[PDB]
Amino acid sequence: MLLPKRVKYRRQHRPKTTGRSKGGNYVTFGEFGLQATTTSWITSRQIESARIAMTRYMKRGGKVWIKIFPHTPYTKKPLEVRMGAGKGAVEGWIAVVKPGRILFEVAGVSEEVAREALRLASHKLPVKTKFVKREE
Amino acid sequence: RVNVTLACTECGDRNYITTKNKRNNPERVEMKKFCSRENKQTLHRE
Amino acid sequence: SSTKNGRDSESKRLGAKRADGQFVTGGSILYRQRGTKIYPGENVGRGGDDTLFAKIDGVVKFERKGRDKKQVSVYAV
Amino acid sequence: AKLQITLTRSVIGRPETQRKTVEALGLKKTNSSVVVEDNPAIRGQINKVKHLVTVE
Amino acid sequence: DKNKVRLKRHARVRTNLSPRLNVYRSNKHIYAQIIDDNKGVTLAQASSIVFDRGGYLYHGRVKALAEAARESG
Amino acid sequence: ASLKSIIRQGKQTRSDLKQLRKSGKVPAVVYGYGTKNVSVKVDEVEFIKVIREVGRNGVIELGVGSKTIKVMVADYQFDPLKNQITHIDFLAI
RNA sequence: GUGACUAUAGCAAGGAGGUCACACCUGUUCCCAUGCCGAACACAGAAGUUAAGCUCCUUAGCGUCGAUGGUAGUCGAACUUACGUUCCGCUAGAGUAGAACGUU
RNA sequence: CUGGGGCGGUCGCCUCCUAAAAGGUAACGGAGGCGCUCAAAGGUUCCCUCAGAAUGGUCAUUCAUAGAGUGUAA
RNA sequence: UUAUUGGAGGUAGAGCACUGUUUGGACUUCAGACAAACUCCGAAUGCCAAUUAAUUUAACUUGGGAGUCAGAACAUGGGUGAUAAGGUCCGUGUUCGAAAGGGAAACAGCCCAGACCACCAGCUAAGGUCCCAAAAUAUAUGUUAAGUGGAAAAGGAUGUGGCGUUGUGACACUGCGCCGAAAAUGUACCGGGGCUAAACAUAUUACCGAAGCUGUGGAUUGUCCUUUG
């Protein structure tokens, strides 16, 4: 769906998921947003479900921003293989999400509409989130 | 690259080895190298 | 399913060989390196491969050369 | 002759640098004690092992 | 900017160099001085031993200077 | 404005601050056009209601040992997770 | 003039300085020179000119140095699956230094 | 050698990362190269400074720590 | 081993100045993001030293003699795998190997602790004190009604307590609970009885508890001569 055009390396180590976030913690493009509270990998193929849901529930009367982006690839092996003999082939693109990271943002919308929309996004995302508003 | 010996021209010795080319320098070379047996700088060929 | 990786070099033990404030004998090696990560100071010299050796048996002290560079000088004991 | 030190916990299962320190204080067995003088350096050997000794 | 350029060449000759018989030309005057290299101290001074050619070409004016100090002792 | 910046003095620990923030208190520093450069406390409920009412970028007087010093509010740290402030900078003019 | 110095020296902006020093400036007669060019290099020189350079003073626009406090991160320890104590203590960022010290 | 053996691959040297800021460090872990070339692409002595843009019609100028070049990988 | 000073080095962290990847505008630039093979930066530790001080008593050399070259789990930093495996490969540590004793019901590797020998003596360690089964039906204050304690998520929900903000209603964080929760011989996921305190959270005491330590006697090795004891 969304993914890097090029990458210098097609097979990579996997990223640490222990820790807290190092950015994206403040709603800056929009008015509202969705702040993760659990660590996970969020994949392109499910960002393209969350975005669909948010886009349609707002009836095309608002504005969505996606802050995270899938940079890293993960590789998997074929169906019935033993261990060893190389590293598997690329399977998808992920993004590691840690507590604090705003996932989506919205604007041009009322508070109740955005509440229900970002509710209806986080049922397709493997992380527990909370609705967050722009800060002080 | 071809590998050549440098016999001297007064002292008959063969006391250096070098690396010439067979197209870029395709002609028997000369050198002013130290002939040890004569204790001198002297002309070397081959 | 075979791969075309699996080969590395041989690690060449490459780094500081005497400590700041140690007494060195006048031919010891003081730092090995690829290209000048540290420069030759006073009484010190660099050879082919850029390895830093002390010419005279004194003390070795690592110093600063400007804002970025560095240097290995050998005072007299 | 201040700071009566006593090894109150074993040095089994402790790391080996710790094993080194506790026997550089001169402690032989468990509950075996000593009385060393408070250096600034002796005081730093009973930071390395605060858990296995009981100064006083 | 000739005196800005002369200095650069000068720097590239005083890395392997040092007493210096440093010189400094001008439109009309020559300034030479023999300066040492371990205290930051100068020894002699005459206006108008390793030889630092200042960053100039060793030729003519600096040549004619340095070749008269050879018979000066 | 109406702030009693109870001076914290000595030197903190990990648990000193973990216990400060656990209660209704918040850490702050005072610097600026003053030679003090003090390390003080605040009640969060008092700072929140003082800067909800004295505006967004206004002024404040801080009672560090009763001497109100005409502080601004230059910086601060925040947890959007725990909905609560972690530290404040008090410039003084 | 010539060394040391971790741009706190710099980049910049204005404005002010004439041959007693520094140049630009005058020409190839030779010394010497341009893969062509007395441009540069260097040789013979005073005029004309600070306009420019350079130096001296002012500006905190960029550049650079930068505290405190807190946070992240851990050494270690003790419950256990990630919190709790104690010490070491960042990056970034706001307060600030700052338009150079300095021999022979 | 071999995540049983066969088949597939590899076997010696160089440079990275894995490698946990000294050095060393494994796997059929992740990327590549070598089995030369130079008589000037060596020594020395002198001089010189780039890449790309904007400007105009290889040439000229301003901008330009530095992004080029360094035989050949990193 | 420690204290102190000096040093080399680019990890965790973080940042976008380089190399790539990338969001939204403006029209190169503001704002925001990612990196094992990125670095303007940069710890904790560890490493090398002084001929420095303090505690301790090993260290090297040259000789004779070997054994080992199948390692395992646990914590932790990583690769691979699928953030599978009591998987496999490496850095650091501990124990087993080669280690008995106490606790984990039973259980090489988990927590405590290193057995010279005898004793119907005492003190503690992990862990515990209703009975099996040694010692508190201790103490002060609260929480939980599920037998939660004493196996598991997304998500649901006037369970219930704390605390703060709010116009009797509404909210953010929280403590403990409910549902989600289905397997094969027999209850069968507290060791059993049993428990509404004999479960939890915080703090005080007491005590039990090992082959640890102490007391006594004994036996062999040592080193100092108080007084060859």
Using CA atoms, how far residue A11 sits from A16, A70, A89, A103, D47, in Å, is 16, 14, 8, 25, 46
Residue A33 lies in a domain: yes
Distance CA A132, CA F44 (A): 21
> For residue C2, what is the nearest residue in chain A, using CA coordinates?
A85
Q: Are strands C39-40 and C69-76 parallel, antiparallel or unpaired?
A: parallel
Whether F80 and A100 lie within 8 Å, measured CB to CB: yes
A8 touches strand H (CB under 7 A): no
Residue D22 CA from chain centroid, whole number: 5
Domains of chain B, first to last: 1-46 (2.20.28.120)
Of A35, A37, A135, the CB nearest to F78: A135
To the nearest whole Å, the CA of A46 is away from the closest chain F CA by 24
- With 0-12 / 13-18 / 19 or more C-beta atoms within 10 angstroms meaning exposed / middle / buried, residue A7 is middle
Range of the domain at A62: 23-136
| Selection from B9, B17, B3 nearest residue B44 by Cα | B9
Distance CA A24, CA F54 (A): 29
Q: Which residues of A touch F80 (CB under 8 A)?
A: 25-26, 35, 100, 132, 135
Whether F80 and A25 lie within 8 Å, measured CB to CB: yes
Domains of chain F, first to last: 1-93 (2.40.240.10)
Residue A17 lies in a domain: no
Q: Which two tokens stand for residue B37?
A: 């047996």
Amino acid at E40: G
Structural Rg of chain E based on CA atoms: 12
Distance CA A121, CA B17 (A): 79
Encode E21-48: b = buried (16+ Cβ within 10 Å), e = exposed.
bbbbbeeeeeebebbeeeeeeeeeeeee
Using CA atoms, how far residue F36 sits from F7, F33, F40, F66, F69, in Å, is 12, 9, 11, 14, 11
Whether F78 and A35 lie within 8 Å, measured CB to CB: no
Residue A22 CA from chain centroid, whole number: 15
With H, G, I as helix, E, B as strand and everything else as coil, classify residue A44. Answer: helix
Q: Which two tokens stand for residue C61?
A: 């002290």
Contact yes or no, F with A (3+ CB pairs under 8 Å) = yes
CA of D7 to C1' of I132 (A): 39
A36 - beta bridge partners? A129
Residue A14 lies in a domain: no
Neighbours of chain E (3+ CB pairs under 8 A): none
Distance CA A99, CA A45 (A): 21
Using CA atoms, how far residue A117 sits from A99, A103, A130, C65, in Å, is 21, 13, 12, 60
| Selection from C42, D24, C76 nearest residue C52 by Cα | C42
Pick the CATH number of D1-56 from 3.30.1390.20, 3.10.450.50, 3.40.50.300, 1.10.3720.10: 3.30.1390.20
Q: Which two tokens stand for residue A68?
A: 């995270």
Q: Which residues of C touch A86 (CB under 8 A)?
A: 1-3
F57 touches strand G (CB under 7 A): no
**Tally of structural domains, chain A:** 1
F67 - beta bridge partners? F64
Domain boundaries, given as residue ranges, for chain E: 1-73
C64 touches strand G (CB under 7 A): yes
Residue A135 lies in a domain: yes
CATH of the domain at A131: 3.90.1170.10
To the nearest whole Å, the CA of C1 is away from the closest chain A CA by 7
Q: Which two tokens stand for residue E36?
A: 């040492």
* C25 interface with A at CB cutoff 8 Å: no
